[PDB]
C-alpha cells in the first residue's frame, strides 16, 4: 500500500494509518516540586531574575505560523537563555515546521547547546480528511532537544487540534520527565493551561503568580541539590 498515493486520492494523511514504567512515573510525581508560575512579559523582563539555573528549559515562543503578540526568530534568538541554563542542562525548543527548523538550530548553538534529538509531533486528520515556499503540505511540528555540558521514541502522534488551539501535546512533558534530568524545570511561554507539578512556568498570559525565588531555591537546597527527579526523596 502506498499511503502517499492514498493521501493524494482521499485526503487521509499517511499517519492516520499508523497503529498503536508506572512505578517510574510515581517516583517522578513524588519528587516533583509544587507547581510554580510567574506572569512576565518576556520581551521586557530580565530573565536573570529567574534563579537558580535550570536543568531543563522548555521554550515555546508563539510563532506567527501557529495562527491562521507573536515572536519572530529575531526576537527568540536574542533571548539570553545561556544566562539561566545550568552548565550541564537540556533544552527543548518548539520550532514549528518552517524556517524555525533552521533558525532554531542557530539558537541552540548560540546558547551553547548541541542538538541531540529531533522530536516530531505528527498530526493526524482522522476527523477532517500554505507557506509560499512550501513544497508539501506541512503536517507536523518539531521540538529540538539540545544538551550542554557533559524508553521513549522521537515521535508524538495526535490528531490535529482545532483551529486557534495552539497547545502542544502534553506528551512532550512525559518524554522530558522520563529523562530524569534534574528537578529545576522551566517552561518559558507556558500558560495557565500548561502549569504542572515539577515545573516553573513563565509567560505573559498567566493570570496569577506564586513565584518566589528564595522559596523556589529552597526546593533544591541540600541535601536535595542533585536529585534526578526519578528517585525517592
Amino acid at each position: 500500500n502506498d499511503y502517499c498515493q492514498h493521501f493524494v486520492d482521499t485526503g487521509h494523511r499517511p499517519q492516520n494509518f499508523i497503529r498503536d514504567i508506572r512505578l517510574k512515573d510515581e517516583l517522578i510525581a513524588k519528587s516533583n516540586t509544587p507547581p510554580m508560575y510567574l506572569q512576565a512579559d518576556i520581551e521586557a523582563f530580565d530573565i536573570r531574575e529567574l534563579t537558580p539555573k535550570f536543568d531543563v528549559i522548555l521554550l515555546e515562543p508563539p510563532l506567527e505560523e501557529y495562527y491562521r503578540k507573536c515572536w519572530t526568530w529575531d526576537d527568540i534568538m536574542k533571548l539570553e537563555i545561556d544566562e539561566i541554563a545550568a552548565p550541564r542542562s537540556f533544552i527543548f525548543l518548539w520550532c514549528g515546521s518552517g524556517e524555525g527548523l533552521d533558525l532554531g538550530r542557530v539558537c541552540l548553538r548560540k546558547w551553547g547547546y548541541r542538538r541531540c534529538e529531533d522530536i516530531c509531533w505528527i498530526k493526524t486528520n482522522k476527523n477532517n480528511p500554505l507557506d509560499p515556499k512550501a513544497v508539501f503540505q506541512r503536517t507536523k511540528e518539531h521540538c529540538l532537544m539540545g544538551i550542554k555540558g557533559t524508553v521513549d521514541i522521537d515521535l508524538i502522534i495526535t490528531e490535529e487540534p482545532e483551529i486557534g488551539n495552539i497547545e502542544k501535546p502534553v506528551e512532550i512533558f512525559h518524554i522530558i520527565e522520563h529523562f530524569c534530568l534534574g528537578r529545576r524545570r522551566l517552561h518559558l511561554f507556558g500558560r495557565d493551561s500548561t502549569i504542572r507539578p515539577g515545573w516553573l512556568t513563565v509567560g505573559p498570559t498567566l493570570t496569577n503568580s506564586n513565584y518566589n525565588a528564595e522559596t523556589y531555591a529552597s526546593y533544591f537546597s541540600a541535601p536535595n541539590s542533585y536529585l534526578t527527579g526519578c528517585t525517592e526523596e
Binding site: 497503529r19 516530531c120 508539501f136 503540505q137
Partner: protein
C-alpha cells in the same frame, strides 16, 4: 530518454557536467557519522546539476546539521523536511530516544516553475524493507511534484533505478545511458570509458 539510466562511478571523480540539468536531485549520502568526509561532501559538484529545481537530501545524526550546511553551500534554501515513519508489515512503528523516523531535507534552487506543490504531505509511512533502503514512495511524490522531467539520484543502488532518473553510485552494474545528448557528451569526455582522478 524516459527508461532507467545509470552510471557505476565514484561520485567524487565523475565529471557530472556531461549529464546536463535536472529538475530534481536526490541523494542518500554516506555521511561520516565506507563514507565521505565532510570536505568531500562539501566539494561535490552539486551546483552544476540544476538551474531551477529541488534537492532531496537524506540526513541522520550530525548530518542533520552538516546536510543543512552542504545544502546552503551548494546554493539551496531548505524549504521543507520530509520524515519517513518506519513501520513493519502491520503498520506499527519499529541515544536519548529510540528513533522512529528518518529525515529528508528539501532544498530549492532558483525559481522553479510548473511544479505541483502541495499535492503530497511531508510524512511518509512505509515499510522498512531492506537495510539501507529508502522507501519507494519518494519516487511517486517526486513524480507528482514534477511529472516527466529529468531527475538524478546520487549514491543510488540497482533497486533505485527508475524511469526519468539517471542513477549514480558505485554498487551499480556498469554504464547504461540512453539519452542521446548524455551519450554524446559521455563519449567525448570519456572516449575510453574509464572514469579516473
Amino acid at each position: 530518454l524516459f527508461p532507467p539510466q545509470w552510471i557505476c562511478c565514484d561520485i567524487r571523480y565523475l565529471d557530472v557536467s556531461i549529464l546536463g540539468k535536472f529538475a530534481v536531485v536526490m541523494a542518500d549520502p554516506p555521511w561520516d557519522i565506507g563514507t565521505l568526509t565532510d570536505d568531500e561532501m562539501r566539494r561535490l559538484n552539486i551546483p552544476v546539476l540544476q538551474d531551477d529545481g529541488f534537492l532531496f537530501l537524506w540526513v541522520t545524526g550530525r548530518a542533520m546539521e552538516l546536510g543543512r550546511e552542504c545544502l546552503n553551500l551548494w546554493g539551496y534554501e531548505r524549504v521543507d523536511e520530509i520524515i519517513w515513519v518506519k513501520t513493519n508489515q502491520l503498520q506499527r512503528i519499529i541515544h536519548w530516544l529510540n528513533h522512529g523516523k528518518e529525515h529528508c531535507l528539501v532544498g530549492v534552487k532558483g525559481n522553479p516553475q510548473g511544479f505541483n506543490q502541495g499535492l503530497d504531505c511531508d510524512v511518509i509511512v512505509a515499510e522498512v524493507r531492506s537495510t539501507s533502503h529508502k522507501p519507494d514512495e519518494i519516487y511517486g511524490m517526486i513524480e507528482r511534484l514534477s511529472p516527466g522531467t529529468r531527475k538524478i539520484e546520487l549514491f543510488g543502488r540497482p533497486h533505485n533505478v527508475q524511469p526519468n532518473w539517471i542513477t549514480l553510485g558505485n554498487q551499480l552494474d556498469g554504464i547504461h545511458l540512453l539519452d542521446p545528448d548524455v551519450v554524446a557528451r559521455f563519449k567525448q569526455r570519456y572516449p575510453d570509458g574509464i572514469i579516473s582522478k
